[PDB]
Enzyme design. Structure first.
Site, short mmCIF file in Angstrom:
data_model
loop_
_atom_site.label_atom_id
_atom_site.label_comp_id
_atom_site.label_asym_id
_atom_site.label_seq_id
_atom_site.Cartn_x
_atom_site.Cartn_y
_atom_site.Cartn_z
N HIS A 40 47.73 43.59 30.06
CA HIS A 40 46.66 43.72 31.04
C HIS A 40 47.21 44.15 32.39
CE1 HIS A 40 42.76 42.42 32.99
NE2 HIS A 40 43.58 42.40 34.02
N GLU A 41 48.20 43.40 32.90
CA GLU A 41 48.73 43.69 34.23
C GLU A 41 49.44 45.04 34.26
OE1 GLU A 41 47.51 41.97 36.29
OE2 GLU A 41 47.15 39.99 35.42
N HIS A 75 47.17 47.93 34.59
CA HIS A 75 46.76 48.23 35.96
C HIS A 75 47.67 49.28 36.58
CE1 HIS A 75 43.39 45.65 36.60
NE2 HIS A 75 44.06 44.52 36.39
N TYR A 84 39.41 49.17 43.30
CA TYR A 84 39.27 47.80 42.80
C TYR A 84 38.09 47.11 43.49
CZ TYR A 84 41.06 43.74 40.30
OH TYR A 84 41.22 42.69 39.42
N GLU A 122 39.17 46.69 35.57
CA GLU A 122 39.47 45.44 34.88
C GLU A 122 39.26 45.57 33.38
OE1 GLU A 122 40.56 42.19 35.10
OE2 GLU A 122 41.60 43.12 36.79
N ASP A 176 34.52 38.22 44.30
CA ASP A 176 35.33 38.84 43.25
C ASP A 176 35.35 40.36 43.41
OD1 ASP A 176 36.98 38.92 40.96
OD2 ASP A 176 35.23 39.22 39.66
N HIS A 213 35.93 41.14 37.79
CA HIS A 213 36.24 40.38 36.59
C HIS A 213 34.99 39.93 35.85
CE1 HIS A 213 39.91 39.80 39.11
NE2 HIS A 213 40.51 40.02 37.95
ZN LIG Z 1 43.29 42.64 36.13
#
Ligand SMILES: [Zn+2]
Ligand SMILES: [Ca+2]
Ligand SMILES: [Ca+2]
Ligand SMILES: [Ca+2]
Ligand SMILES: [Ca+2]
EC number: 3.4.24.27
Length: 316
Positions: A142-143, A146, A157, A166, A226, A231
């Site tokens: 996941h990271e 990005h 974002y 996301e 958020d 998310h």
């Molecule tokens: Zn993320």
């Protein structure tokens, strides 16, 4: 550091033994020279200074409790690199074998992980909500995804573009998890989330509503928290991606599944050829449709399933 490539052995967060690529020069460092221009893992030593110190070990054995988050961050970064190289012919996150850098033991009791524009960063969790987050291969991929997004579409974002950002990370995080083929699933972070509770996760792609996230455009979050719900609204795109791969009927709309591999091809093409920093959900649908047309034809089942899936989640 300059040295000779070696292979250490240690245990990850979940207690499994794995071999890790290291580099020897006086000490054994978590530096993997076998992939691109190197995968480097650092010790942040419970501080928030980054990157911290390149992980140095005296005997190339990493079985200490303190070693475990570093072992997994190092290893799962390698697996993710392998996924993008073997499956999408992409060399690291910038397409040019940029060095991949990760830091573990970030802060104290930190219940999160992130890509900061230069590297991945993993907290250890507080032992109740999270155990060290690098123990989740879907979290690591996941990271790192990005980073891939940063160097391609560059989705802002915030709001819908951020929710796409996301979702993209959840999609390929999950596809990497399936690629490694160890207890794969369509849930996010289950391997490091709440050690006291069986079967739960941070998010669900198959049923985002399980955790209060929207599975339909009519339930999108539009406040300011958020970064506008990046998310949260990701559940709408996660559900569409899930439906494209696995199929199913959702709010009365039936989707013929086309499988994980074709999902990854369509969404990787969309990410790298059509999405831009300001893409919204509707433009993502168009990106995915055009991608599936490029890959399989305008009259293909794949195109029809993409349309079905976004219809199901209310995205036109
Ligand atoms: Zn993320
Ligand atoms: Ca050691
Ligand atoms: Ca799993
Ligand atoms: Ca998972
Ligand atoms: Ca749990």
């Amino acid at each position: 550091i300059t040295g000779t490539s070696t292979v250490g052995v240690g245990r990850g967060v979940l207690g499994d033994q794995k071999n890790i690529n290291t580099t020897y020069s006086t000490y054994y460092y978590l530096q993997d020279n076998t992939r691109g221009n190197g995968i480097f893992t650092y010790d942040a030593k419970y501080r928030t200074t980054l990157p911290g110190s390149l992980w140095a070990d005296a005997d190339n054995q990493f079985f200490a409790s303190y070693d475990a988050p570093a072992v997994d961050a190092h290893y799962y970064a390698g697996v993710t690199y392998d996924y993008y190289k073997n499956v999408h012919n992409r060399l690291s996150y910038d397409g040019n074998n940029a060095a991949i850098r990760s830091s573990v033991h970030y802060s104290q009791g930190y219940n999160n992980a992130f890509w900061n524009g230069s590297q991945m960063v993993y907290g250890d969790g507080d032992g109740q909500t999270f155990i060290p987050l690098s123990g989740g291969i879907d979290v690591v991929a996941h990271e790192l995804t990005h980073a891939v997004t940063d160097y391609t579409a560059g989705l802002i974002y915030q709001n819908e573009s951020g929710a796409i950002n996301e979702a993209i990370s959840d999609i390929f995080g999950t596809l990497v998890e399936f690629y490694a083929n160890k207890n794969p699933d369509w849930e996010i972070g289950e391997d490091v989330y709440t050690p006291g509770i069986s079967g739960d996760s941070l998010r669900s792609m198959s049923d985002p509503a399980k955790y209060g996230d929207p599975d339909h455009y009519s339930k999108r979050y539009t406040g300011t928290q958020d970064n506008g719900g990046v998310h949260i609204n990701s559940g709408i795109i996660n559900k569409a991606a899930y439906l494209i791969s696995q199929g199913g009927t959702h709010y009365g709309v039936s989707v013929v599944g086309i499988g994980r591999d074709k999902l990854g091809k369509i969404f990787y093409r969309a990410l790298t050829q059509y999405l831009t920093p300001t893409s919204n959900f509707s433009q993502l649908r168009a990106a995915a449709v055009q991608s599936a047309t490029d890959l399989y034809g305008s009259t293909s089942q794949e195109v029809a399933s993409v349309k079905q899936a976004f219809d199901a989640v209310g995205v036109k």
